[PDB]
Amino acid sequence: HYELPWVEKYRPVKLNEIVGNEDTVSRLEVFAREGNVPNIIIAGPPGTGKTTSILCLARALLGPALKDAMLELNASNDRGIDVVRNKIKMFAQQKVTLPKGRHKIIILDEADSMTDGAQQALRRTMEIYSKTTRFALACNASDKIIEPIQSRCAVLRYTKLTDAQILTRLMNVIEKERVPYTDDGLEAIIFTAQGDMRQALNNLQSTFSGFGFINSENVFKVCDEPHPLLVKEMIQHCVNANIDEAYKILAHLWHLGYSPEDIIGNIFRVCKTFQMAEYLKLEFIKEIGYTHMKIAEGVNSLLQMAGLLARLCQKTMAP
Amino acid sequence: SLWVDKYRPCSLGRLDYHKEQAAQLRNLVQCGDFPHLLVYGPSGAGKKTRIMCILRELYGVGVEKLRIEHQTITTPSKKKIEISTIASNYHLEVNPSDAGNSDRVVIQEMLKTVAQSQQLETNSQRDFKVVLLTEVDKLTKDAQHALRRTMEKYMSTCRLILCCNSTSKVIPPIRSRCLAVRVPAPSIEDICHVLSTVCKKEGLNLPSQLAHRLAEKSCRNLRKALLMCEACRVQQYPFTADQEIPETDWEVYLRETANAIVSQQTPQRLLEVRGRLYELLTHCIPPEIIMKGLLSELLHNCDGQLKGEVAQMAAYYEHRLQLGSKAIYHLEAFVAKFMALYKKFMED
Amino acid sequence: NPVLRRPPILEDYVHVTSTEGVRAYLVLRSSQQEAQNRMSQMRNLIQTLVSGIAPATRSRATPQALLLDALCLLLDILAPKLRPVSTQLYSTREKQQLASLVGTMLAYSLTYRQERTPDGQYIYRLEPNVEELCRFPELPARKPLTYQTKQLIAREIEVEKMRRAEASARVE
Amino acid sequence: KIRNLPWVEKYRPQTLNDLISHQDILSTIQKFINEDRLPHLLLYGPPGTGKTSTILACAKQLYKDKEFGSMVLELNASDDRGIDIIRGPILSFASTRTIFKKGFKLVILDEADAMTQDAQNALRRVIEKFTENTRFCLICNYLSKIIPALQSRCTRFRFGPLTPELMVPRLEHVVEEEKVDISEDGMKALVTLSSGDMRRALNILQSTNMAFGKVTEETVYTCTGHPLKSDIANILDWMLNQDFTTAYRNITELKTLKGLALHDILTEIHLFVHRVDFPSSVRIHLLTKMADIEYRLSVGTNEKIQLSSLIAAFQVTRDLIVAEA
Amino acid sequence: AKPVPWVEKYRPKCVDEVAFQEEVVAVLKKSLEGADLPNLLFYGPPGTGKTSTILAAARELFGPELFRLRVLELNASDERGIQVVREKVKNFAQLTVSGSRSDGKPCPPFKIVILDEADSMTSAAQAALRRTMEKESKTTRFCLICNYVSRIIEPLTSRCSKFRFKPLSDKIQQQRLLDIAKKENVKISDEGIAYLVKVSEGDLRKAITFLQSATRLTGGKEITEKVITDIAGVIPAEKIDGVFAACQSGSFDKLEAVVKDLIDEGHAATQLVNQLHDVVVENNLSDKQKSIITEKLAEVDKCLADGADEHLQLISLCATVMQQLSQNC
Ligand SMILES: Nc1ncnc2c1ncn2[C@@H]1O[C@H](COP(=O)(O)OP(=O)(O)OP(O)(O)=S)[C@@H](O)[C@H]1O
Ligand SMILES: Nc1ncnc2c1ncn2[C@@H]1O[C@H](COP(=O)(O)OP(=O)(O)OP(O)(O)=S)[C@@H](O)[C@H]1O
Ligand SMILES: Nc1ncnc2c1ncn2[C@@H]1O[C@H](COP(=O)(O)OP(=O)(O)OP(O)(O)=S)[C@@H](O)[C@H]1O
Ligand SMILES: Nc1ncnc2c1ncn2[C@@H]1O[C@H](COP(=O)(O)OP(=O)(O)O)[C@@H](O)[C@H]1O
Ligand SMILES: [Mg+2]
Ligand SMILES: [Mg+2]
Ligand SMILES: [Mg+2]
């Protein structure tokens, strides 16, 4: 036997172990405890826990009948114009014995890749056989799922994970794995997480496998981030209108081969959480977006980053 | 057919003005080895008139039988976009700016379908085909960077008479390969002669002072001058020297906006002129023309030490309007900055 | 001071002189949504207006050029002074002006038609409503054409369309 | 035996001790090699710092010469890498064992930052499902070109640029095995302006010996390019010394005789600007104007007007610098 | 016997007809003799003969029967992506040199890649060509042609050897257009051709295309100075002196009159910026005033490059140069 990664090892089994968007989690736990679930489409950013919530809800609803009352399909399957007619519909017509309040569950993960004709053919199968089976779909972008499929289901939207909801599960994984830790490593790993649970867990695995102790320089050495301490110092130098020290930091970051897009994304993320005057922050964010339009249109060099730094120094002396 | 369509010249020799440039362009297209043309000037100068005269000299009398073609193109986002083009058996006029940001596709796909398609007839039709890419100053830069390779790979098959008002929005890669043809606007005497010839062609009698006022109140735009001359003809056929010329409601609204800024400088007047500017914007007048009219009426009221700063502000806000997406916010910013400057000018 | 009057001894320097010729040295080392709906509706009205224009007059001006210059003064052309007299008692000049006005209405493809009102009377109006595209609420009002005049224009447009149909029949 | 090869291929780090700079990453991957727990890797950084050399050295160390074709599946950007390859040779490679000797295999995808997005989203189940049978080494140039799921699935290694304090003995070994006379000034020239990596210094030496046969600073700059600091000092001495007409005519004489770019005159003048001890407000103004000139030159402008603007940005500061005293 | 485009007929057929480029003519003739040809970097001003010299070298090396199998000339007239230089240049560089000249001339044992107008390439596009150049150096050769040398990155400039291109003096280029019009049996006086080669600013190809299109404009008659200003869109100097007089007057009414005149004269605003800049750098204005005028010309050229209105940018530029000209008055 081989050890699984902590992303799949610490996947929750019960709905009470799922954090984030606690109203929807409580609603799904009530539906799992009682029964009679309606049609559900879960949309949001990836890594939120849509597949995990659907799997836990299906497990708690079915129990021992998961091999007969569950039909699971992903993007690795076809899910074309033939699968809806000849595999979904026969499972909707399949007689499966179930207790009261429990229906057959047809999980269709990653419905964005499914064609429009398949979604048009799925409508009558969902509507007619809703007495016997139910539909639970997970998607990332909700615009790819068409309006009749959207109207037939109770659409749940999941938001991005906050720092406390990530940190609770991170402390759970740390206490289950006995990882020696500090606070700066945790705040750095949730800065590099940016609301993603799976990326946070993989970064924690990388820190534990590479060094085994959690501090800020260890995680910033194994996750090779542009180290927002230096970007924070650069923004602080642009507040004090010191073009020389800010350019020294910019040349130190540029000598290491960092792309302009990554350093301007880090400068935007640092400037979002910076501590200064509000209108100064608005002008800084406007100038950073103005330079980011120049970077994203194609032209990028040390000269335009120096111009960003010089205009950030100029905005201080423009009352 | 109004007075701006029933009285247009047919050939290059029938122009009432710029006759030596008409002779130069007559000798240019007589040989048959003419390069890519880039016609430019102000609005109402006679640009499209001279392009149609160029096409009348190049081809027969079959360039006026124009037809409308509707073409559905496929974006890289797989969203179908309909574009309306004017076509003939001799040339093709495309306005790709109606496709907005998809105009590059109209450069990358539609142009090839007129450049890799050889002419069906080689006797009545000549060796080349003319493509009028109208308002290329409003084209995207990616479309113009895709335009240079189409216009130089197929020099022996397709020619491009690009019509614009500002060649500065056209990249110098295009302007190097193509011949710059300049069409100046007619002068006040030229506009008065055109109006007098139109009225004498209609059996009218036009006093010289009224023709001079019609020429002065159109900002050297011959189309607007002819249409307001017909408006004066319909409104009052006995022509007087002090006849009230029907100033357009857009210009009357800009006059009332200027007098509203003059009369009271308060945020509720700012909301009222926001409503007037929204009414103008929902009437789909382009905001560059709205800015030009606002500055033209506006500097008639300001003092001599105030005209240049308001003109420079107007230029900056027009540039920011062309750089951004929404025009109402930039027009409101222009009016707010002007009323702040007027408040500072009248309070000291 | 970053600018040195005296030249550096060991470090490299770059010279700098101004226009005077004085030397120095350096150190080298809900209104918005409704208004957007109105603008979209009016843009669709402009597209349907220019879609009905014959191709001979469509190339002569842009939709911007037709909108700025050749709509409101065109609206002034389309509403002259017309007396409520029948066509049999009209003069030859009035018949020629009527024929020219009907021809200009046919060139822009504008046709009057009947519309209903909740107050209980019928009204006449153009099939493309260009009066919303020209007139402003703060502008002073103008006298419109009467019911008889607009009905005469509409019936002359219809019989001129049938005249053009029979003209295409006799030439072909 | 002598071979007609480029020196970037003639002197290749076949073993893990020959690579110079990234000692810690090499020690970590050797620790993974020795106890056989090699994970999925993603290698990125500046181009030419020894990522392909590292993965080829690990492949030729872990797999022998008689079994290299049955263990390493190497696909690059010249080979088609569509989703048919993902469902085809890559999937059948990952889902099958080895014919000759029992063990795990390696898949290398060179220059895969230009990969199709469907291939990137399809390789995730190939990585996770067949992690026992094979491991995936994704080597790219930028981290933003791949999905975050692939960033989380493989451990991330940024091969940093080769520092000047450590890249000298590799040059010494190459110049000892090539028998070329070299000075300390040439060593400084090879360590300063050779892109900060040992991927071009060997090529600089090879092209210098191909063109001239001797490697000094004079014959490199007349063969490479990147115009000399005396020339840049003169092209800035015109701007800061002489009047506008003479400066403009002399600099356009240099650009219409030599053939210098305005864009990289801006780049080299920009690098020169922080060397020159300008005042802080003056340097802020010069940096804003120079970035404005670069952004203007990024779009369809006239280059002569931008050259005059570059002179005018210094002309503004001439009086200011003089009156600061 | 059709009239050819007259920039094509007087091109040098051999390397011996190339004038004033003595070093690269000697190097190319030594390559014709059979010496080792290094990787070329052709850099210099436009119009001096970077294209026709290497094209005549390819004509001498391979002839008409082997021009299409060995010589690959790349320019900005076709798409040049990262995958394009990854696939086409690397595959053509891996092709085998086969076929010999049937007229008895010796054939060099390598292919030639003439990379013309190499500023449109990005950093990664030129970064892709490096292994193509070196690993296939036994099979192909590279000649990076740019009018701007340092836009090539320090790696790809280090992979080749330079050859600087000398410019043309005014007397040498006058004669070129002189004879062109003589042979075309067309007439042009000395002042017109002198102002033509002054306006073209050393670009001989631009001057020859100006001569051809001015011959088309006149139709066979005399090409005067006014048609020379018309063929490049050149504003007459008195109209620019009209601007510099209305700005010295200090009256915004006459300034708006001349700006509305120039807009209503249809003059190009970029050409107006170019001519105003040339006039302001050929005059005796002070350095602060001239720097402010030229910086505002660059800002106006940026705004007009991004699509601002011609009338508003022109009245703003003319208002601030009126302020500069009337500041000391
Ligand atoms: N809210 C959460 N609470 C606990 N663990 C979570 C949570 N979200 C994600 N995880 C962990 O991260 C793994 C991956 O989460 P997924 O549910 O696959 O992501 P997702 O939200 O479904 O987005 P996609 O579109 O499927 S990639 C799970 O197996 C868990 O181990
Ligand atoms: N650490 C090193 N020590 C010695 N030589 C090195 C080192 N790193 C790179 N080189 C040299 O650089 C040459 C090419 O290195 P590569 O690994 O192929 O470049 P790369 O890192 O793959 O970057 P790209 O994206 O492929 S251009 C090798 O053949 C070596 O000669
Ligand atoms: N050295 C020369 N000897 C003879 N004729 C020349 C010479 N240089 C230029 N010419 C002539 O002038 C024309 C212009 O030369 P081109 O090769 O087109 O200029 P160019 O080198 O291509 O400019 P760039 O740098 O590529 S934009 C040629 O077609 C010849 O007719
Ligand atoms: N030479 C001329 N003689 C008579 N009328 C003219 C002449 N030139 C232009 N016009 C009139 O002036 C108007 C100018 O409009 P147009 O030709 O479309 O120029 P633009 O494309 O600049 O608006 C036209 O309606 C035309 O009838
Ligand atoms: Mg999922
Ligand atoms: Mg490599
Ligand atoms: Mg050339």
Numbering used by the authors:
A (entry chain B): 33 to 351
B (entry chain E): 2 to 349
C (entry chain A): 165 to 193, 721 to 863
D (entry chain C): 16 to 340
E (entry chain D): 35 to 363
Paper passage:
CTF18-RFC, an alternative clamp loader, localizes to replication forks during the S phase and forms a complex with DNA polymerase ε (Polε). Proliferating cell nuclear antigen (PCNA) is the eukaryotic sliding clamp that functions as a hub protein and plays critical roles in many essential processes, including DNA replication, cell cycle control, nucleotide excision repair, break-induced replication, mismatch repair, and chromatin assembly. In this cryo-EM study, we reconstituted the human CTF18-RFC–DNA–PCNA complex in vitro and captured seven intermediate states in the PCNA loading cycle by CTF18-RFC, including an apo state of CTF18-RFC before it encounters a clamp, two states of CTF18-RFC bound to PCNA, and four states of CTF18-RFC and PCNA interacting with the 3′-ss/dsDNA junction.
State 1 represents CTF18-RFC before it encounters PCNA. Surprisingly, there is no density for either the AAA+ module or the collar domain of CTF18 in the apo CTF18-RFC state, while the densities of the AAA+ module and the collar domain of CTF18 are present in the other 3D maps when PCNA is bound to CTF18-RFC, suggesting that PCNA binding has stabilized the AAA+ module of CTF18. The largest subunit of clamp loaders is the A subunit, which is generally stable and contributes the largest binding interface with PCNA during the clamp opening process of all previously characterized clamp loaders. The uniquely mobile AAA+ module of CTF18 likely slows down the initial docking of CTF18-RFC with PCNA, and this may explain CTF18-RFC’s lower PCNA loading activity compared to RFC. The low PCNA loading activity is likely an intrinsic property of CTF18-RFC, conferred by the high mobility of the AAA+ module and the collar domain of CTF18. The A subunit of clamp loaders (also the largest), such as Rfc1 of RFC and Rad24 of Rad24-RFC, provide the largest contact surfaces with their target clamps to drive clamp opening/loading and appear highly stable in RFC and Rad24-RFC. It is likely that a stable and preformed binding surface is more efficient for interaction with the clamp than a flexible and yet-to-be-formed surface. We propose that CTF18 has evolved a largely mobile architecture to lower its PCNA loading activity, possibly to target loading activity to the leading strand Pol ε to which it is tethered and/or to avoid competition with the canonical RFC clamp loader. Although CTF18 and RFC5 are separated by RFC2 in the CTF18-RFC complex, the CTF18 subunit projects the N-terminal β-hairpin across RFC2 to directly bind to the RFC5 collar domain. These strong interactions between CTF18 and RFC5 contribute to the CTF18-RFC stability.
